Structures are given as C-alpha cells and as structure tokens.
C-alpha cells in the first residue's frame, strides 16, 4: 500500500507503486533510473518540467497504454516530453497513430549491385542526372503519342503515322520490360495501378498487328487507345491525389448521378404535360425533354429553343433552381476529401 | 457542518456531506460503498483516477443534475468515468441527450410466430436470403414501371403496355396488403410517408378503370402517375436523407424563391425601360422579359437573342452578377442541413 | 498587508484586501455580507462552487473591470456564477457586450390612451386580430399594385387601370398619414428607411397628376414607379436581413465590379487582337467584344456565335476560367455577413 | 541545490535558481529587482497576478526561449503579462513572430530637406492636399488613356488621338522621372513591380516613334500597349491583394489548367467515337470537339448545336458533371489565400 509523490515543479501528483511498475521499462518504472531525481528529505521526485504534459503521461499508465495529447499542449512539446519520459517507441508510434500521420512505410530496394543501380535509375528520378533525363524523355514520348492519336483522326489525312506510333510503342515496351526485370518483388508488380495502365497502353497495338497480319470490337479498341493519357500520372502528383480522392468518394458520386436521374425524370414529365395541347412546342415525348432537363439543371443551356407556354416556363424556372440545389449537396464532401489528401503532403 | 475530502491522485477536492447525500444511489452517496476507498489516517477517499473528469462529476451533484463534458476530456474517457462513478442510467442518457446522439428508439416486432416471420421477411431485408430476393424483385418492378410510363408517351406507339402495367399494379397492391396485415401497430401505418406514397402509386389506375368501365382532372391524373419514382426511397438511403434535408429547410427555400421573384420584377422593368425607344428590340412588355431575367440570373443562358442597346447591356451585366449573389446566400444553410443528416449515420 | 484566503471547494486562492475592497458593492467587497461564509478556525471563506468560474471572477477585480469568459466554461454556468457573486448589472451587461448580443434597446410607446391603441394597431401586427387584418390587407394591396404596373405596360391594352391605381394610392397615403400622426417621436420618422420608401412610393402619381392637370424626366418617373416592390420589406424579415447584408458589404461589391471591369477590358483586347486578320470574324472592335467577355466570364453564354480562330479559342478558354476565379473571390465575405445577420435572430 | 517558491495568488510554482538566472535581464533574473515582492517569513515571491499566464512564462525559461501563448489566455492579457515580467523585446517580437503578425518593417525616407518633401508629395498621398491632387490627376490620366486605346480601334475612325496619347505619355514619363530622382535608395527601384509596369507602359510609344521616324512584332506591340490597366494597382488596394493571391497560388492554377486539359482530351475522344457512324453530326475529328468540351465543362454553353445520337448525349451528360467536379477542387485553396491576404489588413 505504498504511495509515491511526483512533484512536477510545484504541481503535486500521487499514485501507487503498482501503476508505476506496470511499465518497468520507462524512466519511472525501474527502481534505479528514477532515483536520479529522488529527494531523500521531501520524499518526492522533483521533475522541473511541464505540468499539463505530465497529467497526460500519468494517464497513459492508468489507461493501460491508451494515449491522447491534451488539447492545450503543442505537438513538439508533448513529443519531447514523451521522449524525456522514455515511454517507448511503442508509445511513440501509438501517439503518431493517434494523431494521424502516415509515416509508417519505407519501400525496399533490390538485393544486388546491378539491380539496385538500374532500379534506382529508372524508378527514382530525384537521384541522378540520367534519371531526370529518362523522366523528361518519357514525358515527351507520351505527349507526342497523344498528338499522333488526335492527328490520326483528322479528315485531311484519312505512312509517317505508323512509324511514329511504332517508335512510341517500342519505347513503352522497353521501359516496361526494364522496370519489370529490375524490380525487387515481382509479387507487388501485378498490384500497382500504374503498371496495369502501362500494359493496357501497349496491348491494342499488338492485337491489331496480330489480327491484321494473321463493329463493337473495333470501336472498343479505338476507344481503349485513349488510355495513354493516364501514363502521365507517374510524373504528376496532382493526378495521383485526384485518383485517391475519386476512390475515397465513390458513394458521393453515385448519389450525384442518382439525384440527377430523379430530377431529369421528374422535370421531363412535368414540362411535357405542361406543353401537350400546343402544336408549336418541340417536346413530343417525355424521352425528348431528357436532354433539355439535363442542360437546364447543370446550367449549360439548351440554346435558343425554349418552353413556349406559361406553365412550361414556370416548370423551367423550378428546373433551373432545383439543379443548383441537387448538384451542390454531395460536392463539399468530395472537396473535403481532396483537401485532406492534398495537404497530407506537407 | 461536516466536510469531506476527496483526493483524485493528488488533486484535492472538498465539499459538504449534504451534496454527496443528495444522490444516495451512486458510489459516493451511500455510506458503505465508498468506504472501499476511505483511508482512516489521512481522512480522505483516494481515487487513483482522472482529474478533469472529476471536476465535471463534482459539478453534476452541485447543479442538481445539469450535466456537461469538459472541452478538454474525450468522450470515451468521460463515459467510463461516469460508469466508474455509477452516476446512473438517468445521468448517462442525460449525457447522451447533452452530446446529441439519436440512440433512443427501438421499433417493435409483431406479437405472434407467423406475423413476426412475414413482417421481418417483407420489412427487414438484411435478415435472410428471401428478404434480399424480395428487395431486388421490388426494385426491378419499380424500374420497369418507370420505363413503361415514358414509353407509353412516345409517339410511334400512340395491348402489351396495359398487360405490363396491370402486372406492376398487381405486385404493388400485393405487397401493400401483405405489409399492412402483418404490421404490429395499425395506428402507425397511416402516418409513415412511404405507405402514403404506395397508396398514391396504386390509386389512379383503379379510378381510371372505374370511370372507364362504369380537362384538368385527366391532366392531374396523368401527372399524378409520376409519383412511382418515390417508391425508390424505401430502398435508397440517400433519398431519405434528401427528404429530411428538404423538410428541415423550408424557410430557406421560400427565401430563395422570394429573392428570385424580387430580382425578376426589378431587372425586367429595367431592361424594358432601357429598350423602349428602339424598334428592333424583342422585349415588348415587362411580362416578356421575365424569362430572359430568369435564365440570366440562374446562368442557364437565353440563347443568341441579346439586349440591343448600351443601357440594356449595362442592365444585363448587373442581372448576371445579381443572380449569383441572390442564389448563393441561402444555399450554405441547406448544405449544412445535408451534411448534418448525412454524417449522422456514422 | 493583510491577505485573504478564498477556498472554492478545495482550490485555494489568495489576494489582498485592497483588491476586494476596490469593488465594495459586491459579495466580497462589503465586510458584513461575506462573513456569511467565513470559517473562524481555518481563516478562509469556503464557497462550495465552480472553480474555473472563480478564477475568471478573481481576474475581473484585478483587471479593473475588464471581463472575459474562460473558453472551458459554458455561458449559463458563468452567468449564474456572475449572478451569485452579485458583480453588478454594470458587469453583467459588460459580459453581454463582451459576448456580442444585441439585447440593448426597447423602442418606446406613445404617451396617451388613444395614440397607444392606434400605434400598436397599425405598427405591431402580433398584438390583436385587427392588426393581422391590416397586415394582410396591406400585403394584398401592394401585390395588386405590382400586377397593375406590369399589365399597364402590356401592348394589347396600350379606364379601369387609373381607378385601381388611384385606389391603391389612396390606401398608401391613408396608412402613411395614420402612421405619421400616431407615432411617439416625430424626430425618428424622417430617419427610418421604410418611411422614405413609402414617400417615394406615393410621390410620382401626385407629380404626374399635378403637371398633367396644371425625355429623361418621364423615363425617370416611369422607372421610379417600380420602387413599390420594396414596400414588402416591412412584412418580410428575410428582405430586412438582405438590406443589412448589402449595407455591411459595400467594399466587397465594389471589388466585384472592379475585378470584372479589369477582366472585360483585358479579354476583349486579347480576343480582338487574336481575330483581326480574318474577314469572317464578328469582333470588329475592342468595344464589340465587351458583351462576349461579360457573358463568358459570368458563364451565361453568348449563343451560337464563337471565336473563329485557334488563338481566339485559346483566349476564350482562359476567359471562361478567369471569370470563375474572379467572381468566386469576394463572395464568401458576403455570405458570411448574411449568415451572421440571419442567425443573429435566434 | 537551492529552490525558489513563486506564489501566483495561491497557485504555487517551484523551480531552481539556475533556471531563473539563465535570463539575468528580466524581473526574476537579477537578485535585487525581484526582492520587491519577496516575503521574508513565507519564503516566497507573492505576485497577485494571472495564473495560466504564469505557467506559460515559467515554460519560456525552461524551453531556452521557445515561446507559445496558452489556448485559454487572450492576447492582450498575455501581452501585458509579458510586459509585466519584462521578458525582453527579444521575447516580445518572438511572441509576435509566433502569433504571425507582419509588423516588422518601416520603409525609409530620403536624407535631405528637398528630397523628403517631393518624395512624400509624390509617393504618400495621405499626407497633404497636393498629394491627393496628384493622386486624382494620375487616376484620371490613366482612365483617359484606356478610353483612347479602345476608341482608336473602333472602325468609324480608322489627329486628335495622337495628341491625347502624347499628352498621356508626357505625364507618365514626367512622374516616372520625378519618382526615380527623388527616391532614397536607387537599388530598390529596379525591384518594385510597379516601376517595371510604368516602364513597360511608356516603352512601345517610344520604339514606335523611333522606328517610324528613323507581323508578330507589331502584333506584340499593339497587345503590349494594354498593360496600362495595371497602372491602377498603385491606387487600388484590392488589386495588390489580388496580385499577392495569384503569386501565392501558382501550383493550384497549374493543377486547374492540367485537369481541364485531361478532361478535354478524354471527352472529345469519347463524343467523336460515339458519333462517327452518323452523317448528320458536326464533330468531324477529335480536334473539332475540343471547343464543345471546353464550353460544356465550364458551363458557358455551345449554343443550339448538340450531340445528335443517344451515346453522344450520355457522354455530354457526364461532361457537364465532370467539369463541375474538376473545377471545384483546386478553387477553395485560392479563396483561402485571398481571405488570408485580405483580412491581414485589419
Ligand atoms: K450557360
Ligand atoms: K453556368
Ligand atoms: K447558351
């Protein structure tokens, strides 16, 4: 039933020896490290230190390791108070996990001299000079492949285009093979999103050459060749934050599309029933005002043609207001996700 | 005039025995449960516990049951401190009512073996496999009734449509009767909004069949058949949150419509008086610029036709600014109501 | 050099007798009211009370009347602690002036039996039944005068209109005379904004009748007859909050108009210089793209006609982005003013 | 091993004499200034003062000069507590640098009687009457030069314009020479942005006169004459805040333009591939839907012409939603920068 008096510069605390011996790897736990500060006469351990920090430290032992920082104590002061009390790296990364920093992982490096040099050359551009050369050459090759895609579909042209496209495909396949064979773990390579993007960027050229030298299919292939824009996400950090934002916000995008569908059916029905007994109106069905309701609710504008009645113009006024209301509701959640993932960098 | 000294790990509190005996059902109220911690020599009750939590607990007795959590104490720590002090379930749900959680109701179940099984089968879809089957069949029947409504009004057609519509009405009436006759309390059934929606979804078919086998009326009936979209609110949780948001925000919607009316009258008057002495302008009245002012203030756009004078274009510039200002003012209150009801789920 | 020990339920405070006698109208100031709580043996004044509240109360005397509420003490608890300490109504309305409530004025009533009855009948509608009758009759007369204004300017008509307009003017002048002759202070009557609005609502009828029974002038008079919409601000509380918002935000409205002017001159110059060597473009001057730049920056839309070059479409893309940026900057300050004046009601 | 007891009105603190002597220029550091408050009997220094402020002051010595204000202490109370403790102007501007006020610089004045008078006359308009006269004359000359620029390019005219333009250039060069020769430090003059703006405002007149009395070049010169709008930034404080905002937000503007480029390429590709097998569609290439995708994503509107298929209208619906999402993401960071630099004035 022995007690112990800990005096943090005038603010006197008291507890049991069991609570101090529950963590016998800290400053106050072992009976010899804390006799550094013991005063024989006053029977107390005088720590000329910080007082709100010590009431948080004393709660950590009582809570059996549950941790929190008081709201009136700054992070650096509390950090070096944890360090002074030598609570433990367990308690330190508990405090980090509690505050919410993502400082937990360090990705490995290949176990050889040759692999380490080519993997750090082709993967980490901040290292060397040749690394920045590979980065700038890669961004330029991606940009000219986009230009070749759009110029292919111009009507003055429809071969130099096949030669430029096959040079771009040679460079893409070359750096994909070099990145694959120089990686540390091949089990991780078929889980990165960017390596899947590079594979889908080089596939349709090879299947076109195969079936060409051996309706919906060829339209799918000509629209799947547009996924070479997403090869810029390796060199752009705002695009990676945009992908993280869009993955964290999938319920809000579904709600946006669902609310717009409900409003389009409702206001198309209303404007068609308001303009049926008028032979000079343009709405001939309810599936004919769908596009008018979409461009009125989003505020793009349908052009000169307008409802022609009085009830149709009252319905159009309500459609223009209701779209602003409908769209403005799930969008602050998506911009909060963006602000979170974006300022997480600092 | 006896005092009592309560020592929360060094932080010494003092009060009267009357204040402790005012709640004689707690830990400190009865004279035998709190002699667990009484120290005979120091004449104090040593609780090796949390200090800001205890100043809140000591205030609860003094305030005669008024409760609050200090701003520097987290909710779980204060919750188990209330639990340790055994303040009472009265004090615990007072603390819950103070913080503002809606954890108060549990809706009943029918008092029989048969009724409980069919009511939980047709009302709670998360229970069983047949429950999810009934849910998916119901959503599919609602969707094909919407498709039948719009395809009915196409002009290439205007019978398979009557057969599909009467099958949909048979399913709606069947599940309405099964939900009605299997419910616990029939006094609650004519107060849910969704049961009223189901009744209005099946009424106009039956009154059309009745008066057909026995202007504004038939137009009202053909526009009241569109309320089958709101039968999706039973299966969608975002739509229920949208209804709660729109009911909590009825003053702000009235202010939005009132501000837009004031602006439409004002800017229509101004643009007509700016373009009266010009024979090539299109505004022939003040009730002819109402629609131009609506689409300019909302930013939809009126199309190619524009004011034709210099004063008319100065008035149009001010209309385009004033609509943004007018609309942007009552909308943050509606999106705060949405964020409240939406994150209330977690 | 006498000290005094004040013991707030265990938390011991200490000060000088000079600091307590500096306010000798309070509980601790006079030497007989505070001997209610003095303990002769322990030489202290035991107040079984609230501890953070007492450190704020002890600071009030030291600061010579400067007051503040601690951030960890709620408003009702601190209010009744001020009341318990009987600091003074001076200190109580200092605390109210510090927190920022507008509970300071009570507007007078006429000093007679007859004047008090007609002034409360015609000014305060929440009193009686005839008061609500006068309110509803007034709103209906204002609404039919607005309808008469717009129907006057229709072209099928251009007398019942003169009879309806002269009945509306008789009612406006009647209630203006009754409100003027029944008011308590006639010095305040020519400072309310609403009485000036009523005078401007009845003036142009009388000057038209005078000069008619005795270009810019008559156009000014026909546009000054539109100020009868603002007679609804007496019966509407959202419109009064809108007027307070617009008066508090006059620097931000000037910045909005100035930023839009800078952008219109800049992008009109750029699009004209990008499309000068092309005979099929529509911009013939820099003062001919002013209206295109206004409707592109505000997002209303100019219609089918578009820049016709490549440099003109690059300039148009930048105009569409820059308007969103320019407009979005001074608008959160205006909506914060609105939220302040609007939630000030509760 | 001597200790010292400091009693802040009942709240007793304790520390070592080394910690107090570490700053021997303050109130508690020198052994004679603090014997003002020493009580010989109780062996303590009684400061009838503020208690949370003193725990912050005691931490300052322990942290070796690191400073912070507690979150529960207001700024004026803590300021005069620092002043009472005479911590030092070093500690006072450390506290100011910690809170984040920009009260650090005072710009010099010329070292002569004549230079000081003309520099304060032509640079500081708030001083005198002639200073405000120079300010109003300068703003009027800038405004008529803008009017001359636009009226020059009207087609009814294309000499009074050369005379008005040469008078404006004489005034600009005159005040530039007077401001240059009367300044204190000529090393600072070629680093202000506004003096560079004045030089670029007077250059192209002189090079036109030189090469005229001695394609892309003359188009560059006729578009560089538009930089006379930015001479209003000396007389306008909202424009200076806009320039500070736009310089602090250069990463967010690049992200806005990059996200819009990605979306334009994506939705142009999709709408062209959705409308290729239809001879009545208007999209003939992917570089022909670029402008439609820009005006649909920004909500300006493309006019009457619309996608003509069903897949094209589904793609157009997604384009109209995706632009709102894309644009709304980096814009709250720019408006937070604006609010910061704008309310920094108060
Ligand atoms: K538009
Ligand atoms: K728009
Ligand atoms: K349009």
Curated annotation (Swiss-Prot), chains A, B, C, D:
Q: List all topological domains (Cytoplasmic).
A: 183-193, 237-252
GO terms assigned for molecular function: delayed rectifier potassium channel activity; voltage-gated monoatomic ion channel activity; voltage-gated potassium channel activity
Has keyword Acetylation?
no
Keywords carried by this UniProt record = Cell membrane, Cytoplasm, Glycoprotein, Ion channel, Ion transport, Lipoprotein, Membrane, Palmitate, Phosphoprotein, Potassium, Potassium channel, Potassium transport, Transmembrane, Transmembrane helix, Transport, Voltage-gated channel
Q: Which residues lie on this side of the membrane: Extracellular?
A: 273-313
Q: Which family does it belong to?
A: Belongs to the potassium channel family. A (Shaker) (TC 1.A.1.2) subfamily. Kv1.3/KCNA3 sub-subfamily.
Q: What is this protein's name?
A: Potassium voltage-gated channel subfamily A member 3
Q: What organism does the UniProt record list as the source?
A: Homo sapiens
Q: Which gene encodes it?
A: KCNA3
């Amino acid at each position: 039933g022995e007690r112990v008096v800990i005096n943090i510069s005038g603010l006197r605390f008291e507890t049991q020896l069991k609570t101090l011996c529950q963590f016998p790897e800290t400053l106050l736990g072992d009976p010899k490290r804390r006799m550094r500060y013991f005063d024989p006469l006053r029977n107390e351990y005088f720590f000329d230190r910080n007082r709100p920090s010590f009431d948080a430290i004393l709660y950590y032992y009582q809570s059996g390791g549950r941790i929190r920082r008081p709201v009136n104590v700054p992070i650096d002061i509390f950090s070096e108070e944890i360090r002074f009390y030598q609570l433990g790296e367990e308690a330190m990364e508990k405090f980090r996990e509690d505050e919410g920093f993502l400082r937990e992982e360090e990705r490995p490096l290949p176990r050889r001299d040759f692999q380490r040099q080519v993997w750090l050359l082709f993967e980490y551009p901040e290292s060397s000079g040749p690394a920045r050369g590979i980065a700038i050459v890669s961004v330029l090759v991606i940009l000219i492949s986009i230009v070749i895609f759009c110029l292919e579909t111009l009507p003055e042209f429809r071969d130099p285009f096949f030669v430029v496209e096959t040079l771009c495909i040679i460079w893409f396949s070359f750096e994909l093979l070099v990145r694959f064979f120089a990686c540390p773990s091949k089990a991780t390579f078929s889980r990165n999103i960017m390596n899947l993007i590079d594979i889908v960027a080089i596939i349709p050229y090879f299947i076109t050459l195969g079936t060409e030298l051996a309706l919906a299919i060829l339209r799918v292939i000509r629209l799947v060749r547009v996924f070479r824009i997403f090869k810029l996400s390796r060199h752009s950090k705002g695009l990676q934050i945009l992908g993280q934002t869009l993955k964290a916000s999938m319920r809000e995008l579904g709600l946006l599309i669902f609310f717009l569908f409900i409003g389009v059916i409702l206001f198309s029905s209303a404007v068609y029933f308001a303009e049926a007994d008028d032979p000079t109106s343009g709405f001939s069905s309810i599936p004919d005002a769908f596009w008018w309701a979409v461009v009125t609710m989003t505020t793009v504008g349908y052009g000169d043609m307008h409802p022609v009645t009085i009830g149709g113009k009252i319905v159009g006024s309500l459609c223009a207001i209701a779209g602003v209301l409908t769209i403005a509701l799930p969008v602050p959640v998506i911009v909060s996700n963006f602000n979170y993932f974006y300022h997480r960098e600092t």
